[PDB]
Design a protein around this ligand. Structure first.
Ligand SMILES: *C(=O)[C@H](CC(=O)NS(C)(=O)=O)NC(=O)[C@@H]1CCCN1C(=O)[C@@H](NC(=O)c1ccc2ccccc2c1)C(C)C
Lengths: 167, 88
């Protein structure tokens, strides 16, 4: 809808130029695209991510507009997530899909995403390397040779990341 | 017969910021990274592969301003362009 559509002319030209160096997309009538959105708004310790609802509404709608099936999950923990991710790599719809969109939205540390039960005393994070593990050609051979885009919205530390310099 | 397949491939991560650094969120408009990616997705989904659009999102963060943050694409292992061909 809101997503600017691609005319047949352009769709043809683009494929006309890149043809062999572009991922083949399944037929619009048969493919069953799946997208997963895990976003923690409330936390046992860390301050609630006030305003997360507007992001959930944003992505879901967008991905769904890109022709994906969005299954939204909320306030999970390291485990709950690592369990929810495995059940996804298993989904049968992937077999008849051309790609998938993963979307994580939560607080975070240098190490990774923060589950809803994370704390200084008792950590609850999900390393990024793990997410890549649950969906590789070994634990999810259905997505093999298909683009898997992973989006993450979380702090990667404390520093502001800006450095002073005079002009 | 059995054949070998790369264990890791066709991946592409897009983080909201760089290591050790924070990402910004507005209590009324939510995260900024998410709103920009959407804004761009809606516009360039039809002529740019997800890789070109992510770059365009980064470039949109090129000029700092109080709530600065530089998104980064990590562990990219895409072997070809990934067009979304919206409308198809
Ligand atoms: C990383 O952990 C978070 C990401 C998140 O959404 N979750 S959480 C539990 O941490 O809130 N990033 C932050 O929290 C960063 C780092 C510390 C403050 N912070 C913010 O995003 C604050 N943002 C603002 O104050 C703010 C952002 C954008 C913006 C745009 C236009 C006008 C005013 C503002 C204000 C929030 C409020 C804590």
């Amino acid at each position: 809808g809101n997503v600017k559509l691609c005319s047949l002319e352009e769709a043809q030209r683009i494929w006309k130029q890149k043809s062999a160096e572009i991922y083949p997309i399944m037929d619009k009538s048969s493919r069953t695209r799946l997208a997963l959105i895990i976003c923690n708004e409330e936390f046992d310790s860390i301050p609630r991510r006030t305003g997360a609802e507007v992001d959930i509404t944003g992505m879901t709608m967008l991905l769904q507009n890109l022709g994906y099936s969005v299954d939204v999950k909320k306030n999970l923990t390291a485990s709950d997530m690592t369990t929810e991710l495995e059940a996804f790599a298993h989904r049968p719809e992937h077999k008849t899909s051309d790609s998938t969109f993963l979307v994580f939205m939560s607080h975070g540390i240098r190490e990774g995403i923060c589950g809803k039960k994370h704390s200084e005393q008792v950590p609850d994070i999900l390393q990024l390397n793990a997410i890549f593990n649950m969906l590789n050609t070994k634990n999810c051979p259905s997505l093999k040779d298909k683009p898997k885009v992973i989006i993450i919205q979380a702090c990667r530390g404390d520093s502001p990341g800006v450095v002073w310099f005079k002009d | 017969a059995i054949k070998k397949a790369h264990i890791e491939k066709d991946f592409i991560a897009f983080c909201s910021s760089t290591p050790d650094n924070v990402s910004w969120r507005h209590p009324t408009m939510g995260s900024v990274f998410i709103g920009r990616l959407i804004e761009h997705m809606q516009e360039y989904a039809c002529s740019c592969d997800v890789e070109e659009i992510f770059r365009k999102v980064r470039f949109s963060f090129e000029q700092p301003d109080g709530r600065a943050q530089m998104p980064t694409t990590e562990r990219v292992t895409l072997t070809r362009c990934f067009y979304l061909f919206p409308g198809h």
